[PDB]
Amino acid sequence: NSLPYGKINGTYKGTEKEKIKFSSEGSFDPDGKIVSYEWDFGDGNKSNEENPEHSYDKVGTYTVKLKVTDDKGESSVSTTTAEIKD
């Protein structure tokens, strides 16, 4: 019955066109298992890797979302930012 806890380990920073390593380490479900991790990098791109690398084409500050869903189909969403400069 218990919702999963996502941990998105923000904030993130890097430079345009250089890969940034994201981590969902510490995410957990008290009464089950997390069966999916869904990242949205805020630049229209997504991943279902636990700990993806992603580069941003353009500078800016992007909203990063991590949606975790458990084995009973229940989800929760964590957010942070990725600040991309020169």
Numbering used by the authors: 685 to 770
Task: List sentences from the manuscript.
The collagenases consist of a collagenase module (s1), a variable number of polycystic kidney disease-like (PKD-like) domains (s2a and s2b in ColH and s2 in ColG) and a variable number of collagen-binding domains (s3 in ColH and s3a and s3b in ColG). The X-ray crystal structures of Ca2+-bound holo s2a (space group C2), Ca2+-free apo s2a (space group P61), Ca2+-bound holo s2b (space group P21) and two new forms of N-terminally truncated wild-type apo s2 (space groups P21 and P212121) are reported for the first time. Comparison of crystal structures of ColG s2 with crystal structures of ColH s2a and s2b suggests that despite common tertiary folds, PKD-like domains can be grouped into two subsets.
Similar to the molecules in the holo s2a crystal, the four apo s2a molecules are similar (average r.m.s.d. of 0.5 ± 0.2 Å), with molecules C and D being the most similar (r.m.s.d. = 0.2 Å) and molecules A and D being the most divergent (r.m.s.d. = 0.8 Å). Molecules A and B, as well as molecules C and D, are related by a noncrystallographic twofold. Temperature factors for each structure are relatively high, possibly as a consequence of the high solvent content in the crystal (61.8%). As expected, the most notable difference between the structures occurs near the N-terminus, where Ca2+ reorients the interacting residues Asn685 and Ser686. While neither structure could be refined using anisotropic B factors, comparison of B factors revealed that with the exception of the N-terminal residues, no significant change in B factors occurred upon Ca2+ binding. Unlike s2b or s2, s2a truncates β-strand A through an approximately 126° rotation of the ψ bond of Ile692. To accommodate the change, Tyr696 packs with Phe706 and is involved in a Δ4 Tyr corner, in which the side-chain hydroxyl group hydrogen-bonds to the backbone four residues prior to it. In the s2a structures the termini are the most flexible. As mentioned, the B-factor trends in all holo and apo s2a structures are similar despite the difference in crystal packing.
